[PDB]
């Protein structure tokens, strides 16, 4: 189960944080008004974070802490609502059986036992706030039968705690208060128990042969990968828009609209020129670069294999109602020997060819492509980007 | 003490004796909290005395 | 056998050895470090009613797709604010949407088995789901979509363990994926158009990846300590990242096969749940559990930022293919747009 990992790491952490050589002090304060001991302040546990965590940012580490302390691992004394405020108000750490990772889950009538405890513990005051009182409410309207038994337990509890000595029913009072904080908050705060529903749950022969396609599952250097991505950061690195911008046009920044315009307009920026001069698949993704490629491919009186692999792709677009319908034509207008459109295959190209035409496919023309791409990627873009159209294009 | 065997076996043994006074003071309840029908105060005693007992080996495990 | 065996691990060892001589950190010092980022918000959104769990660009790289839990689907404009949309779904916790190349329609489904799709555009004024047309449909809850490319053919995943394609009007599987064992939750696109590709990875630790021109599992990878919750490829088409519960991220490789380099820090310590890549390819992002974001350079291996902006726990994010900026999903029942 996942989340018991985070639990288990936090609970490295508050393990670490109690630690006996080092760790915060838990002191007893002396007011004029009493005596607190067992205490400590939130800027205490604040230092403690950024001297064993080094936690750069004050903010951060004050928000890993905070949503610590929203998890029932520390609470403000005299507050419902867990929230860690760097400054001098008193905490505390949580007991082992009231920890979180153990599972646990109140149910009402318990909340039922808590409130008539805590009501009847003090008859001072109604020692609770409006939203505690609004549940109490609720419980006594709809658990009619099953009160007594419920306020007998509580004023039992309630005598065998105080029967041990008054600081003893002060400490566990109070833990047991904030551990029902955690787990039924203030409406405002969020709950920090819910998960996603998501998580809510021969033959040596073979072997051998996957030891063999590891053998031949060609490799390269660590290095040779290093160069690539660094070489692929770099050739837009200078077109990022989040760390180097050429065009500091921002339309979600500097309120303008032009920059996407611009890339709406046909004519392509200098910037967009020089870009197409990396690689033709770049090319064909941009139409810009395929209307100009193809415009010289006519021009050059070579506009057919671009035709061709326009056409595979085309093709591979529509659904099966229409793909036998391509595939015979568009093997008797190109693949169909004596059609005006001649690609043009080796032996094992225009065999697969020949046999799947007659079942139309996903992946019907895939070595043909293979070999009219490899074709073209080597011919066709060299002598593009060498071509006075394109110079003169990147010029302005 | 905030500690974890001594806090804890005191929460432990807190929640014990909560649960044993609770347990006797339903064995005196039983006619004292004559307000209601017999079956049903049949049935809660009945299911306080299996959950306390199935709590109490627990502990003892 | 056995022991024929891991010689051939330890020849493989051997090969690793020799071209991973220098470790990519090792050689990416190289590169000059980079500098102080700004970035802080720009917009906000105000519409759902609820927790918000899916969220998608187009490519027009100006609007707004979100699904939410509570069966309300939007349509948004962030650059106006402005809704000019709006569909409710019959089911609950709908768990993916998807947007369409051109802006035709969007695929969101799960826990109902099934993934509608409703035709995007200004063609009926009386419901963006009254012409709900069942297309897929499993036998459990949907994961995630990608509308690859053609507008016409999606992906889907679900707890089956198993995914496929999915026509548009005909509900016609066309082939299918059974590598795998668990609850599969990622799904994404090649960036090329060389191999129609795509990854599938899941609770089993793993990482496997189908070739879509036959359906058998190529690639595969485990390196996780738990369930692993998105991916996402390196943009060049060369390899692919992520991080999952563990809190731990990493960033693998397809032709060396073999992992880059850790994506960890002590300090972070709650689940990972997106990643996505800048266009640069230089930074990285992930939405974490912690309620921050957390922004990564790629080669030096150092925080750049942490940007505290949402309540609640961070749902799912993404990149504007424009490459201008990004969103994030989040537990605080309302979306920002990060600059």
């Known amino acids: 189960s996942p989340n018991m990992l985070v639990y288990r790491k936090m609970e490295d952490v508050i393990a670490r944080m109690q630690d006996e050589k080092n760790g915060i002090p838990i002191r007893t304060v002396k007011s004029f008004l009493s005596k607190i001991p067992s205490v400590f302040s939130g800027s205490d546990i604040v230092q403690w974070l950024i001297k064993n965590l080094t936690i750069e940012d004050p903010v951060e580490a004050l928000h890993l802490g905070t949503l610590m302390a929203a998890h029932g691992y520390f609470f403000p004394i005299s507050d419902h609502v867990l929230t860690l405020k760097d400054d001098g108000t008193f905490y505390r750490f949580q007991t082992p059986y009231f920890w979180p990772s153990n599972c646990w889950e109140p149910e009402n009538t318990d909340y039922a036992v808590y409130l008539c405890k805590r009501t009847m513990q003090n008859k001072a005051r109604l020692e609770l706030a409006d939203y505690e009182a609004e549940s109490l409410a609720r419980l006594q309207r709809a658990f009619a039968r099953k009160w007594e038994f419920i306020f007998m337990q509580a004023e039992a509890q309630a005598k065998v705690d105080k029967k041990r000595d008054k600081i003893e029913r002060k400490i566990l009072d109070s833990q047991e208060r904030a551990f029902w904080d955690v787990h039924r908050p203030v409406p405002g705060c969020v709950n920090t128990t819910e998960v996603d529903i998501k998580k809510s749950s021969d033959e040596l022969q073979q072997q051998i042969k996957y030891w063999q396609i590891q053998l031949d599952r060609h490799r390269l250097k660590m290095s040779k990968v290093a160069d690539s991505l660094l070489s692929y950061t770099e050739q837009y690195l200078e077109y990022d828009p989040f760390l180097l911008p050429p065009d500091p046009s921002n339309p979600w920044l500097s309120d303008d609209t032009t920059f996407w315009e611009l890339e709406a307009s046909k004519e392509p920026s200098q910037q967009r020129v ?8 770049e090319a064909l993704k941009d139409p810009v670069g395929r209307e100009q490629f193809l415009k010289f491919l006519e021009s050059e009186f070579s506009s057919e294999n671009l035709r061709f692999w326009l056409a595979v792709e085309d093709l591979k677009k529509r659904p099966i109602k229409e793909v036998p319908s391509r595939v015979q034509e568009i093997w008797q207008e190109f693949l169909a020997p004596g059609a005006p459109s001649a690609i043009n295959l080796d032996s094992k190209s225009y065999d697969k060819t020949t046999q799947n035409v007659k079942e139309p496919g996903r992946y019907t023309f895939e070595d043909a492509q293979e070999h009219i791409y490899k074709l073209m990627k080597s011919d066709s873009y060299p002598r593009f980007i060498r071509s006075s159209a394109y110079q003169e294009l990147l010029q302005a | 003490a905030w500690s974890e065997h001594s806090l804890d076996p005191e929460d432990i043994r807190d929640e014990l004796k909560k649960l044993y006074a609770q347990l006797e003071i339903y064995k005196r309840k039983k006619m004292i909290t004559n307000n209601p029908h017999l079956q049903k105060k049949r049935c809660s005693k009945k299911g306080l005395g299996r959950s306390i007992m199935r709590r109490i080996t627990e502990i003892p495990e | ?61 100006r609007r707004i797709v979100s699904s939410s839990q509570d069966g309300k689907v939007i349509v948004w404009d962030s650059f106006t604010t402005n809704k000019e949309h709006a569909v409710t779904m019959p089911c609950t916790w709908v768990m993916a949407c998807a947007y369409a190349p051109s802006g035709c329609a969007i695929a969101c489904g799960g826990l109902d088995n099934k993934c509608s799709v409703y035709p995007l555009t200004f063609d009926k004024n009386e419901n963006m789901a009254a012409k709900k047309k069942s297309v897929a449909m499993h036998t459990n809850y949907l994961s995630a979509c990608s509308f690859t490319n053609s507008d016409m053919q999606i992906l889907t995943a679900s707890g089956d363990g198993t995914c496929a394609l999915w026509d548009v009007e005909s509900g016609q599987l066309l082939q299918s994926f059974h590598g795998h064992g668990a609850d599969v939750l990622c799904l994404d696109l090649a960036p090329s158009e060389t191999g129609n590709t795509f990854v599938s990875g899941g609770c089993d630790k793993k990482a496997m990846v189908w070739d879509m021109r036959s359906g058998q599992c190529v690639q595969a990878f485990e390196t996780h300590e738990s369930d692993i919750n998105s991916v996402r490829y390196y943009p060049s088409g060369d390899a692919f990242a992520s991080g999952s519960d563990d809190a731990t991220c990493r960033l693998y490789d397809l032709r060396a096969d073999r992992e880059v380099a850790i994506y960890s820090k002590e300090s972070i310590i709650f689940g990972a749940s997106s990643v996505d890549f800048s266009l640069s390819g230089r930074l990285l992002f992930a939405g974490y559990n912690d309620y921050t974001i957390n922004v990564w350079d790629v080669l030096k291996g150092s925080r750049v930022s942490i940007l505290f902006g949402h309540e609640n726990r961070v749902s799912t994010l993404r990149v504007s293919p424009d490459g201008t900026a990004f969103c994030s999903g989040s537990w605080d029942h309302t979306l920002r747009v990060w600059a």
């Open chain 3, 1 to 61: 056998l056995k022991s024929e065996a891991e010689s051939l691990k330890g020849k493989l060892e051997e090969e690793r050895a020799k071209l991973h001589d220098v470790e990519l950190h090792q050689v990416a010092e190289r590169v000059e470090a980079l500098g102080q980022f700004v970035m802080k918000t720009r917009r906000t959104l105000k519409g759902h009613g609820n927790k918000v769990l899916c969220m998608d660009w187009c490519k027009d790289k």
């Open chain 1, 274 to 281: 020089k870009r197409w001069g990396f690689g033709m698949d």
